[PDB]
Structures are given as structure tokens and as C-alpha cells.
Design a protein around this ligand. Structure first.
Ligand code: MG
Ligand code: ZN
Ligand code: ZN
Ligand code: ZN
Lengths: 49, 196, 140, 263, 133, 113, 56, 394, 66
RNA sequence: UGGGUGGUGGC
């Protein structure tokens, strides 16, 4: 989840910005208020300790 | 599995379905007009690959970005004794007079979303009002009432029949009766009634 | 391994048939680009598989590469609301919501990725019969 | 005038060739043989004792799908007009079953062959589970383990497919007429050429092709049919056909009587 | 009853847009500059280039809702092969003798030009047609 | 949960007739008949069988909504025929054909065994 | 939130479905919603019989 | 959102608990059937009952003063079906016609005369469409300078309310002002315009039942030759954009009014690939047959358009963000599968493929950014629209 | 879960043909050919057995509840 | 028959 809050309707943090290859999901994000924020870790994600 | 969603519009018993040449009837009939603007051609590709992998009896690799074209699926459906592009000549169930266009027809994987109609039907005569404001309560769980909101009042003004609006915001809500002294104009007037 | 900073400094081809420069005009297949800019590339990385770019509620979808992408987003944000089998111990668990779908079929358009969400061994729907045909105005 | 021509027959299916009736009358036969055949199935289920890995209405549902013998069924009346308040042995086939995995190890498959008729308005051979061979254990109702006491008591009453399709008499009905489209009732969709791509019927070889010089026989009508009335085993296919015609007669005759009684 | 009679030469056939409906353009023999166009059905009455057509326009086939015909009655059409009913929808007195009648057969069309002395009785509302041969 | 009975498909109510006729007085010699508790299975069979007869002029049925097991039919024959009589003869002919059909089918299954 | 617009009663709410076997000014009513909501019709001298039946 | 968004109705009682509608009222409320909620307020007095029944009833709100046109028309199936019905070459036997004219609640009891008498009576469907539309209408339209001889059979002239010729489509009976519905309203009051939708929808549903209509995967396929022509054309377009690159990166390019060098560069790119898409989609439209289903639907206008068939079959075109081609998200490239500073169409998001053939993954992802634009738009600018609309109201 | 009784589409009773299907699978058959031998020829009674995946074994993996 | 916060989902 992403804490910009919702103050700022800005479409630059909501873009599918093109570092996203294999890191988040270009399909999945909810409909509406969450959209552009909520990033599902991909089927090749791993978290570095 | 491509979003072409919606509700069960209607239920037909068994005979009243259309039915192809062997006896197969269908169970779910999405709309032609659901397709051509939504541009979801993958849904057709799934239905076709489904029918083939049913008849040759195994589960076909539909993981994307392979050389699985449409041509292999077409040739296999034909060479296992069928039409190449899916269609079979289906019938009216009320006459059997053949449906003039051939109907496209197969299995596909379906799912069941969590909503139902038995969780969002609600109507309300009266009942629970809040202590604080005596306007009827909010939520489904306490059998609340609906918010006849701002822009509903806007369209009531646009129609103009304000007598309906005086029904809505007086009479099916917190109808309330006060008193005024006509000189200082206020509501300070203490009301005893059986002593009057 | 690479994170998003080394993603800056790499050079990828998508599938391992594109590493060797390949050999036409068949109207079934798909058209990879030529990559004839660098005559002598130094590819450093090639994808294991492209359907590994997806999310978990995205690899379920049969052929995501033939749709209008808002419907991909919709299918991924509806795949979570399936009725099915959530864990196999619903006898002993006591939870405020649980729903078992009766007769769950692994889809005939399985993927190769649904082995790794076990969905062919716990599915959440069925195969019923599609027939895309306006019949009596009820699917308008 | 109308002529019957049986082509195959065995006990799981019949493929006949009804010739020279209208199209509506043949499809009306089809609608009958899915819908209005009075048969017998499990109508109220009362668990005496269950402790299974399966829930209850689950198993009552699956029991409702189970094929019974109803060859003798027309001397059994309908449930909602039989002269008893709740069930007696005039209109029921009471199955009481309790298999029970006694011994604390292993797999117990309550099959169709273990299902016991206890009573029934006998000795009409109704309500037996249908048996492929006689060594047909059959319908996979339950898998029981250690002490899982499953004692069930069913009633069997008589419904049609209109109430619910657990009273389906039969399975799947082919239907076609004019396999070479000599009426042009249908219109092919076609990329290239209509003749090449739509493969011939399984009744193509029972008639001739059309000749290209022939005109559209506008006063011709559809006249030869083919259908396939398979069985669940609950009836035999000849009996299915017979009683479906019989029932359709009876409905038509009741319409006749209401005409003549309003008259 | 018949208010027209002439015999025609089939010059063009346009199947084209329609698999069951074709457009003929018939130029008269007995008096030229009488141009006749009639859209027609193939599979009730196939026609071909350079045949012969007897063309007749009537207003009553006797020699209100349509039932299908009995056997005991008889028509003017009984010596004919392709009988279409129509409606006179546009009547334009044009030039010197450019006299154009537009009568529509319900989705089907019929343009007719030529001398005033033939077409002069045609100013009606419901006009049949009766193709012979 | 407002789900009604599914024996509303064949069982008539008490004071409702199974066969409810009203003659339509727009045109002469036409009738409207309110069938209770059926579907197409009666109706199409009656339609094409009333179609081929000479004296029958107009006959047409509609099922108002398929979530209700009723339908209504229109029946205008020619001038002379009381059309009720024609429909009763239609039932006679249909049962004649089908009883012949059952008869020869019994014979043919006798041979095919 | 409470005076210009508020919540009120004699409402109802559901999910919809198409049905072309209808006029243009008709809307389908599920039976339970017809049971819950009501309408005060005045007992007049031209509607006694049916209203007594609706009591019954 | 507008003064029809509350409309009065009448009560029909049905089991199986959902709300039923007509489908002609789908356009004014803007409701689809993927799960909308619609409320139902009830009057509690006689006064408000008459208020609703005389003002907010649907037949008195047909014509929107927004744009002085009817805003309640025909939707998906009734429309594309009636366009398939009253093509010129459509004939019906008498027997099915009996039922079809039984469905009209306003039919008198008189069949028309069948437009063929012999050798076997048929009809054409335009007279059946004429059974619904009442007596006293005129409508004359000239599309494209047609004649009174009508070769393409488009256009429309109606006298008496019986069709004389013409394929009845959206641009007559849709939402277009001065159409059929508006004319009926002006010439006959509300109630007959109410019964128009009943007559047409019940008729064309019964006929679109007994005909039927479907859509299959072949309908977006053209033959291999037209695929070759589309491929040649779009390849020649990529040659053209190579010429653009050659001259502009050889500094041979002339600058438009008001835009500097990269802006006119990208504007040239946008025009050129749009020309590619338009000519290719035009060829793919031209080849397709007329028994082809998809071309029937777009040529009916009940749903979709030209760019739909172009995108499904021939080319999808350029993926956009904010009108432009795609930003170099990284340095000099808009994925890590590309080289630096390559303004080729496959870099910055031109789908060369159809939908049908499959996308290369990069092209799939760039179309994901298109959907991302659409999502952020539809859930962000509706803030400004709601606030503006509230302020104009108050 | 466990095999249903009829087909979903047509209504031919199939539930008996589960154990026979596994026993035919044990010899190394192929699944289509095994359905071929059982006389399953419409695809309705081919998807009603071909898709089906088995959970009730996992429910009997619970060593005794009582 | 609570309030009051907060989260996720529907159009
Ligand atoms: Mg919506
Ligand atoms: Zn005072
Ligand atoms: Zn009894
Ligand atoms: Zn089956």
C-alpha cells in the first residue's frame, strides 16, 4: 500500500510507471480510490532482507 | 474470465434452450452486444480452446505468449469432425425451425462473485431513529433508510414539483412540532398540554 | 537477481527463441521486432517467462494478451471474489465468513502457472456452456 | 401416414427415424421426452444420524440425483394428491440406510447397491437403484471413516421435470431434419465457400445430395427427422418413448375435455 | 382492368448487394425511350439477360384483410408467374416527355419513363404488377 | 427468497378455469383463449396444426413472459366456422396421428427385439 | 448531512435486471419489497370492497 | 445528473427478487447490468402521486432541453435486429408473420397485403415495421445525395407511416434529433411515443428470436490476402515514419506554427500512424462481407464503431499517455527491452498486431498504461465534475 | 471434490464411472481414450468427468475427528 | 438496541 494519503489528485504517482516490469502487477489494482496506489508483489517478487 | 460480467437475467428450463445437433444445450449465454465494443477477443479464444481440449480430452496450455495461434485450434477442431470456427447449427426450442445464423457454442471456465441479491435487497417503512437527531438510521444491518441526497433534491427542483419535496423532508422523516411566542419570536415557550 | 536500480543498466530479449536471430509471412503467428539496430548486441538478460510479469490474481486469466487492459484489471480485481475452497480444514475452523462452492472444476483453459497457486487442486468455479447468441432480449 | 423407422436400438439409447410428420409435432415430442415424464425420486430426506465429512443437504442433493427404477410408476400416484397426510406406504418408497464404518481403519463407500428399499406400494418393482450389470455398486455417495455414523431415512415421491430436474427421465436428445439444407431454412456463415467447410451429417448418407440445376422447391416442407432418446437406466427407451407419447396424449385430451366442458 | 401492357428486353441484372434480390433494367421494344427498372427476387422467379418479359400494371386483380387464397376463386394473375403488390409513392410530371413514375413494392422499387399517352392513366395509389414468362 | 412454486407450471388453481375463452369483438368470428398452466409444448403443436387447414384464417399465440407459465392465443377462422369446433377437430386429428404412431412403434420394437 | 439532504424512509433498494417484455413506464417489483413498503389509500366510498379484502 | 435521473413509473409485481426495467430507459439513467443499485421512493399522499404522474412520468420527459432531442431511444439487440430485419432481401412466410403481428398491442386486426402474391406468398419486413408506426407520419431524409431510385438502399422516405425504402438504422431511430421518435412526439403527443417502443421492441425481439444472431471468432478474421494488404500498408507506414526519422534526424524537417521541433516531430508521428490505422482499418472494413456479423453491428450503430473493427482485426494503433507517445520512463527508453533513443513505433507503444494475433509482451504492457490512463481519468476528474455541478446548482 | 451423478449439461448418470476411470488410468491409458472406452461421446459427459479434481481424500486425511 | 473511529469491496 502507498502513503501519499489521498491529498493530491496527481496522476504522476498513479501511473503504471515503466520500471514495473515484473515487480508489480500491470493488471491488478482495485477499481476507484485505491487505483494507481495499490501494488501487488509480482509472481517473481522477493524481499531483500 | 474476461470481465464480461452481469447478473442472471432469467432462468429457462431445460427444453427451452437452444440446442445443437447432438442434444447439448447450454447453460450460460453472454450477449453478442457485450463483445464488439469491449474488444475482448481472448474470451472467444478461451471458448474455442475449451471445446477442443474437451473433445481431445486434455487441458491445453493457455499460458500466454506462446506460439499457440488460432490456426492449430481451428485445424484440430475441424479434423476431429466439426466446424472450423466454432459454430453449430442450433435451433429454436419452441419450434426447431433452424436458427438462420449458426451459433457459436462451447464450454468456458466460470466463477461466482461474492455478492448476491439476498444481501442487498432492503426496504423500510419506519422504525429505528437515532436519539441525537431523530432522522432514521444509517446502515443495512439496523434496517436503516436511504439518503435522499442533495442531487436528488436538485432534480426534484428541476422538475419543480416541490410538494413532493415537502413530503420527503417533512413527512417521512423527523416531523417535529415546536411553539413560538409572537413577540420575541423565539421557541422558549414552555408547553404543558393537559393543563394547557 | 536485479532490483529496480539495475533495471536501468540491462538489455533484455523476451523469449529464448529471440536470443538467436531467427529466420515467411504466415498470418497465424505473432511478430517480434527485428532488433537490427545493434548488429552485435550484448544481451545480458533474457526473461524466464513473460507470464511471470503478472500478479498472483493476474496469472489466473486465460490469455491476458488478447484483451483491452481495463478488463484485465477488472478480472484480476474480481478473481478475489470467487466462491470456492479457501482452506481444506473448514470442519474445525470457526470463521465469521466462509463459503464452499460445491463442485469445483479445474479449468480447461488452465495455465502453466496455476500449478503454483494450486488452483487446479482447489478451484473456485466450474466449466459451464457458453453460447454467445441473443436469444430473446434477455441478455441485452 | 406417419412412419417409424428404428435404426439402432440398445438399452442405453435409441436412434430412430420418424418420418412424415410436421416439424412442430416432432419437436413437441422432444420437449415432452425431456420434461413431462412422470417418474420417481427422493423427495423428503430425514437424517436419523449423520457424522460425516460431508454436510447434510449436500447428501440430500446428491441422493436427489440418483437414478431409480420407475417402470411400474403410473400405478403410483402423485405426491401432492395422494390421500395421506405425511408419508405412508400408499405413495412412498421409504429408504432407510445406515452403512457405518465399523472398525477404526479405512474407507467406506456407501454405494447405490447398498441402498435398501424398506417399503413401497408393492410388489411393483419401483425404487430400486438402477443397475448396469448386477455387479454395479455404482453411485458414489459417501466416503466414511472411523465411527462416522451415517443413518439416513429417505422418502421417495413422484415428481416431474417441471418441479425440478432431479426428476429428469432422460439425458440428451439429438434432433435434425433436412441435413442437406434443401429448404434453405438455415444460412451458412462462410469465409470462402459454403460447401467445403461444414462437414456432413451422420444422416448425410441416408439421403442424396442436391443438384445445382434444381430450383428452390418453395412448396416443399421439412419431412424427415432423426432423434436420439437415450436412457438414464430409469426406464427402457421403448417405455420412455411410449409413455412420453402417452403423457402428451393425456395433456392434449385434458385440453379437449376443458373445451368440451366449458362447452 | 390492366392499365399498362408492353414487352421488355432484359439488359442488366444486379445481384450484387443482395443474394435473393436482383435489379433488372428493361428497355422497351414496342416504343423505345420507355425505360423500366424492377427489383426482383431470384428464388421465386429467376431472370436472365436478354430474355422476354410481359409486363402488366393493374389496379384490381378482380376481373378487407388478406387471407391466403382459396382454390374456388380466381384472379387476373392466374396466367402469370411473379405477382407483386406496390404503392404509388411519387409521381413527377417532368420535361417534354420525361415522365417518371415512382411506385414502391414495399422495400422494392419501380421506375418508369416514356410517353404521356401510356402513363396518363396511372395516377393512382395502389398499383400491382404481373410479370408473365 | 421470493421464489414461488414450480408446480405453477401445470396445476390449475381452484376457481380459475383451465381454459378461459374471451371472444374478440374487433373482427367477426375470432376468439382469444387464456390457457392456464402450460408452455410452448402445447402451443406450437397447436399452431402449425391449425395452420394447414383451409377454413382457418388467423391463428397466433404469445407467451407474455417466460417467467410465468401461461400464454394466450388468437383464433380467427373464416366466416362459417365456429373456431372452437375446428380446434376440437384439430385435437381429434392429432391424437389420431399419434395413436397410429404409438401403434406402429410398438410393432416395430416387437420386430427389432 | 441532515437538513438540505438527509436519510429518509419509504425507500427501497436492490440490484436490477433487464426485461424487454414490458412497456416503457413499468418497473418490476419483487414480492417482499411489495410486502414491506406500503401506501396509504384513503378509505372512500368508491374503494371499500377491495380494501376490506386487503385486510382479509 | 440531469432532470430525467428521477423518473416516475408504474408497478408490476414479479417474483424472483430483482428490479425489472425496459431497456429503452437504460440510456437516461445510464445503467448497465453489472450490478447497479436503483432506489425506489414511494409517495405517501394523494398530492405527490399526482405530482409524479403528471410531471416526472417518462412520456413527458422524452425530449431533453440539454440538446432539444429525444434522449430515450433503442438499445443493443432491438436495434441491430431491426436493421437485420428490414434489409431489402428479407422475406418471411405467412405463418410466422401471424405471431409477429399478434405481438403488437396496437394492431387493429388487419394484416397487410403480402408484397408477393405468387408463387408462394411472402412479405418483406419493412411492412411489418410499418405495422407498428401509427398513421400520420412523414419523414424524408436524403443521405449522401441519394436518388428516388435508391441503389445503395440507404436513406429514408416514409409516407403514411409505411416504409417506402431504406435501411432503418441508428441515424434514423437512435437518439438523433429530428429522428423518428422526435417526430412521433411532436405529431402525436406523449402516449403514442410511449407505445412506439413497446411495439418495436416486442416485434423485433420475436423476430430476432426466430432468426437469431450471434458472433464468432471468424467474424474478426479476414482472408489471408487482405491480411497481406494491411500488412503491406502498415509496413509502408513504418517506412514513412522511417522517412520522418531520416529527415528529422538528418535535420530536413519543417516546423509547424506554434510548436517547436519535438512537438512538430511527435505531431507528424501522430498524424502518420493515425493515417496508417485509418487506411488499414478502411481496407479491412471494405473486404468484409455483409452477412458478417460484426460489420452488421457497427453498420447498425447499436454498439461500437469503425475503430473497433480496425483494432480487433487490422491494427490497434499507438498507445498513448496524456495524448502523447510514451515517456521514456527510464533514461532514453520506455522499457529495458529497447535501445536508447529509438523513436520507432514499437518502442513507444504502437501495437502493430491485431488483438487477434497476440501481442508482444511490451505492446501488452503499453496497452496496460492506456487502461491506466482511463482508470485514473474516470476516478479522478469526476471529482471536478461533481464539484462544478454542485456549484452551478447552488 | 467427489464425482457428481449426472452430467451438468445433458443428464447421463456418470458417477459410477469414477472408479472404473481411475482403474483404467492405472494401466497407463490416456484420458480421452479412457472416456472413449466408457462410452462418453458428447463433451457434456466428458467435462463432467475430465475436469474433476478430488478433495474428499484430503478430508479423510483428518485422522479421526471423534 | 449503542456510540465513535478505521479498513476493504460494489456501481
Ligand atoms: Mg456499470
Ligand atoms: Zn416573547
Ligand atoms: Zn398414501
Ligand atoms: Zn454430460
Amino acid at each position: 500500500n502507498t502513503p501519499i494519503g489521498r491529498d493530491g489528485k496527481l496522476a504522476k504517482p498513479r501511473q503504471l510507471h515503466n520500471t514495473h516490469w515484473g515487480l508489480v502487477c500491470p493488471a491488478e489494482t482495485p477499481e476507484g480510490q485505491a487505483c494507481g496506489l495499490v501494488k501487488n508483489l509480482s509472481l517473481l517478487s522477493g524481499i531483500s532482507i | 474470465r474476461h470481465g464480461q460480467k452481469g447478473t442472471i437475467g432469467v432462468t429457462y428450463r431445460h427444453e427451452d434452450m437452444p440446442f445443437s445437433a447432438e442434444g447439448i444445450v447450454p447453460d450460460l449465454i453472454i450477449n453478442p452486444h457485450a463483445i464488439p465494443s469491449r474488444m475482448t477477443v481472448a474470451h472467444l479464444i478461451e471458448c474455442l480452446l475449451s471445446k477442443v481440449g474437451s473433445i481431445r480430452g486434455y487441458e491445453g496450455d493457455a499460458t500466454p505468449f506462446t506460439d499457440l495461434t488460432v490456426d492449430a485450434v481451428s485445424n484440430l477442431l475441424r479434423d476431429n469432425g466439426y466446424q472450423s470456427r466454432g459454430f453449430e447449427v442450433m435451433y429454436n426450442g419452441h419450434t426447431g425451425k433452424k436458427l438462420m445464423a449458426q451459433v457459436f457454442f462451447g464450454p468456458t471456465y466460470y466463477q461466482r462473485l461474492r455478492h448476491m441479491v439476498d444481501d442487498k435487497i432492503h426496504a423500510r417503512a419506519r422504525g429505528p431513529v437515532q436519539v441525537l437527531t431523530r432522522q432514521p438510521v444509517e446502515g443495512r444491518s439496523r434496517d436503516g433508510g436511504l439518503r435522499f441526497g442533495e442531487m436528488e433534491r436538485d432534480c426534484m427542483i428541476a422538475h419543480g414539483a416541490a410538494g413532493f419535496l415537502k413530503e420527503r423532508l417533512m413527512e417521512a422523516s423527523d416531523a417535529f412540532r415546536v411553539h413560538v411566542c409572537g413577540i420575541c419570536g423565539l421557541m422558549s415557550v414552555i408547553a404543558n398540554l393537559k393543563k394547557n | 537477481y536485479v532490483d529496480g536500480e539495475e533495471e536501468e543498466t540491462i538489455m533484455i530479449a523476451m523469449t529464448p527463441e529471440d536470443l538467436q536471430t531467427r529466420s515467411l509471412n504466415d498470418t497465424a503467428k505473432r511478430i517480434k521486432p527485428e532488433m537490427s539496430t545493434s548488429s552485435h548486441h550484448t544481451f545480458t538478460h533474457c526473461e524466464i517467462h513473460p507470464s511471470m510479469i503478472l500478479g498472483v490474481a493476474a496469472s489466473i486469466i486465460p490469455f491476458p494478451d488478447h484483451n483491452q487492459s481495463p478488463r484485465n484489471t477488472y478480472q484480476s480485481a474480481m478473481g478475489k471474489q470467487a466462491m470456492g475452497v479457501f482452506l481444506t480444514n473448514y470442519n474445525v475452523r470457526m470463521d465469521t465468513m466462509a463459503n464452499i462452492l460445491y463442485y469445483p472444476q479445474k479449468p480447461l483453459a488452465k495455465t502453466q502457472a496455476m500449478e503454483y497457486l494450486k488452483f487446479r487442486e482447489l478451484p473456485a468455479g466450474q466449466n459451464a456452456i457458453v453460447a454467445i447468441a441473443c436469444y430473446s432480449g434477455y441478455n441485452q | 401416414e406417419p412412419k417409424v423407422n428404428i435404426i439402432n436400438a440398445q438399452d442405453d439409447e435409441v436412434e430412430l427415424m420418424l418420418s412424415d410428420v410436421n416439424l412442430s409435432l416432432a419437436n413437441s415430442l422432444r420437449r415432452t421426452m425431456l420434461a413431462e415424464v412422470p417418474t420417481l425420486a427422493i423427495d423428503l430426506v430425514e437424517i436419523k444420524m449423520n457424522t460425516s465429512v460431508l454436510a447434510d443437504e449436500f447428501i440430500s442433493h446428491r441422493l436427489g440425483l440418483i437414478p431409480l427404477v420407475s417402470e411400474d410408476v403410473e400405478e403410483m400416484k402423485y405426491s401432492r394428491d395422494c390421500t395421506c397426510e405425511d408419508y405412508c406406504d400408499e405413495c412412498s418408497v421409504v429408504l432407510e440406510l445406515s452403512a457405518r464404518h465399523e472398525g477404526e481403519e479405512g474407507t467406506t463407500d456407501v454405494y447405490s447397491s447398498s441402498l435398501i428399499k424398506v417399503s413401497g406400494p408393492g410388489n411393483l418393482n419401483v425404487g430400486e437403484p438402477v443397475r448396469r450389470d448386477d455387479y454395479d455398486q455404482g453411485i458414489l455417495l459417501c466416503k466414511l471413516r472411523n465411527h462416522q455414523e451415517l443413518n439416513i431415512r429417505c422418502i421417495a415421491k413422484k415428481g416431474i421435470a417441471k418441479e425440478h430436474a432431479k426428476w429428469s427421465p432422460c439425458s440428451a436428445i439429438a434432433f435434425e431434419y433436412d441435413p442437406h439444407n434443401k429448404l434453405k431454412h438455415t444460412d451458412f456463415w462462410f469465409e470462402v465457400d459454403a460447401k467445403k467447410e461444414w462437414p456432413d451429417s451422420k444422416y448425410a448418407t441416408w439421403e442424396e445430395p442436391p443438384k445445382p440445376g434444381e430450383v428452390f422447391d418453395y412448396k416443399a416442407k421439412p419431412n424427415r427427422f432423426y432423434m436420439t432418446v437415450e436412457t438414464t437406466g430409469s426406464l427402457k427407451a421403448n417405455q420412455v418413448f411410449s409413455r412420453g407419447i402417452k403423457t402428451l396424449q393425456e395433456k392434449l385430451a385434458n385440453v379437449l375435455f376443458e373445451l368440451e366442458n366449458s362447452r | 382492368s390492366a392499365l399498362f401492357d408492353d414487352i421488355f428486353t432484359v439488359q442488366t441484372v444486379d445481384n450484387g448487394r443482395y443474394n435473393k434480390v436482383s435489379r433488372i433494367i428493361g428497355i422497351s421494344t414496342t416504343n423505345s425511350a420507355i425505360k423500366l427498372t424492377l427489383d426482383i427476387n431470384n428464388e421465386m422467379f429467376p431472370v436472365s439477360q436478354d430474355d422476354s418479359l410481359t409486363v402488366t400494371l393493374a389496379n384490381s386483380l378482380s376481373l378487407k384483410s388478406w387471407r391466403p387464397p382459396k382454390p374456388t376463386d380466381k384472379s387476373l394473375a392466374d396466367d402469370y408467374d411473379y405477382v407483386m403488390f406496390g404503392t404509388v409513392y411519387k409521381f413527377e410530371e417532368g420535361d417534354e416527355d420525361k415522365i417518371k413514375v415512382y411506385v414502391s413494392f414495399g422495400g422494392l422499387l419501380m421506375c418508369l419513363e416514356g410517353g404521356y399517352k401510356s402513363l396518363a392513366s396511372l395516377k393512382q395509389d395502389n398499383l400491382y404488377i404481373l410479370i408473365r414468362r | 427468497m421470493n421464489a414461488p412454486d414450480r408446480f405453477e407450471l401445470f396445476i390449475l388453481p381452484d376457481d380459475v378455469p383451465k381454459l378461459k375463452i374471451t371472444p374478440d369483438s374487433r373482427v367477426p368470428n375470432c376468439i382469444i383463449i387464456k390457457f392456464e398452466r402450460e408452455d410452448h409444448t402445447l402451443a406450437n403443436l397447436l399452431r402449425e396444426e391449425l395452420a394447414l387447414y383451409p377454413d382457418v384464417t388467423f391463428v397466433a399465440y404469445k407467451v407474455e413472459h417466460p417467467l410465468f407459465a401461461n400464454f394466450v392465443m388468437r383464433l380467427q377462422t373464416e366466416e362459417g366456422t365456429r373456431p372452437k369446433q375446428a380446434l376440437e377437430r384439430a385435437c381429434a386429428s392429432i391424437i389420431n396421428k399419434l395413436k397410429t404412431l404409438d401403434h406402429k412403434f410398438n410393432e416395430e420394437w416387437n420386430i427389432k427385439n | 448531512g441532515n437538513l438540505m439532504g438527509k436519510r429518509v424512509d419509504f425507500s427501497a433498494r436492490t440490484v436490477i435486471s433487464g426485461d424487454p417484455n414490458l412497456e416503457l413506464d413499468q418497473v418490476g417489483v419483487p414480492i417482499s419489497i411489495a410486502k414491506t413498503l406500503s401506501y396509504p389509500e384513503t378509505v372512500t366510498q368508491y374503494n371499500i370492497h377491495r380494501l376490506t379484502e386487503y385486510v382479509r | 445528473l440531469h432532470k430525467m435521473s428521477m423518473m416516475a413509473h408504474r408497478v408490476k409485481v414479479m417474483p424472483y427478487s430483482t428490479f425489472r426495467l425496459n431497456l429503452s430507459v437504460t440510456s437516461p439513467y445510464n445503467a448497465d447490468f453489472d450490478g447497479d443499485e436503483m432506489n425506489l421512493h414511494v409517495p405517501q399522499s394523494e398530492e405527490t402521486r399526482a405530482e409524479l404522474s403528471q410531471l416526472c412520468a417518462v412520456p413527458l420527459q422524452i425530449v431533453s432541453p440539454q440538446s432539444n432531442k429525444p434522449v430515450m431511444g433503442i438499445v443493443q439487440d432491438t436495434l441491430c435486429g431491426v436493421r437485420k430485419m428490414t434489409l431489402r432481401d428479407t422475406f418471411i412466410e405467412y405463418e410466422q408473420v401471424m405471431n409477429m403481428l399478434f405481438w403488437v398491442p396496437s394492431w387493429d386486426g388487419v394484416v397487410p397485403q403480402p408484397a408477393i402474391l405468387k408463387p408462394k406468398p411472402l412479405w418483406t419486413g419493412k411492412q411489418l415495421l410499418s405495422i407498428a408506426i401509427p398513421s400520420g407520419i412523414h419523414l424524408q431524409r436524403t443521405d449522401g445525395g441519394n436518388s428516388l431510385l435508391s441503389p445503395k438502399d440507404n436513406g429514408m422516405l416514409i409516407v403514411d407511416g409505411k416504409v417506402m425504402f431504406g435501411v432503418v438504422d441508428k441515424k434514423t431511430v437512435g437518439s438523433g434529433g429530428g429522428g423518428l421518435i422526435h417526430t412521433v412526439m411532436r405529431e402525436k403527443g406523449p402516449k403514442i411515443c410511449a407505445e412506439l417502443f413497446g411495439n418495436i421492441q416486442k416485434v423485433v425481439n420475436y423476430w430476432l428470436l426466430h432468426n437469431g444472431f450471434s458472433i464468432g471468432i471468424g467474424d474478426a478474421i479476414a482472408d489471408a490476402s487482405t491480411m497481406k494488404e494491411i500488412t503491406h500498408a502498415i509496413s509502408s507506414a513504418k517506412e514513412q515514419v522511417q522517412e520522418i526519422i531520416y529527415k528529422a534526424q538528418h535535420n530536413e524537417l519543417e516546423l509547424k506554427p506554434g510548436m517547436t521541433l519535438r512537438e512538430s516531430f511527435e505531431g507528424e508521428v501522430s498524424r502518420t500512424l493515425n493515417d496508417a490505422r485509418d487506411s488499414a482499418g478502411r481496407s479491412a472494413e471494405m473486404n468484409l462481407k455483409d452477412l458478417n456479423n460484426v460489420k452488421q453491428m457497427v453498420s447498425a450503430g447499436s454498439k461500437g464503431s469503425f475503430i473497433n473493427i480496425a483494432q480487433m482485426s487490422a491494427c490497434v494503433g499507438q498507445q498513448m499517455v496524456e495524448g502523447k507517445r510514451i515517456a521514456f520512463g527510464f533514461a532514453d527508453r520506455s522499457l529495458p527491452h529497447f535501445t536508447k533513443d529509438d523513436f520507432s513505433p514499437e518502442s513507444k507503444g504502437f501495437v502493430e498486431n491485431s488483438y487477434l494475433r497476440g501481442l508482444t509482451p511490451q505492446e501488452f504492457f503499453f496497452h496496460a498504461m492506456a487502461g491506466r490512463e482511463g482508470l485514473i481519468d474516470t476516478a479522478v476528474k469526476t471529482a471536478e465534475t461533481g464539484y462544478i455541478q454542485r456549484r452551478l446548482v447552488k | 471434490m467427489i464425482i457428481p451423478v449426472r452430467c451438468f449439461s445433458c443428464g447421463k448418470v456418470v458417477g459410477d464411472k469414477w472408479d472404473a476411470y481411475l482403474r483404467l488410468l492405472e494401466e497407463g491409458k490416456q484420458e480421452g481414450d479412457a472416456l472413449d472406452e466408457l462410452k462418453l461421446k458428447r463433451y457434456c459427459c466428458r467435462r463432467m468427468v475430465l475436469t474433476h479434481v478430488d478433495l474428499i481424500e484430503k478430508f479423510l486425511r483428518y485422522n479421526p475427528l471423534e
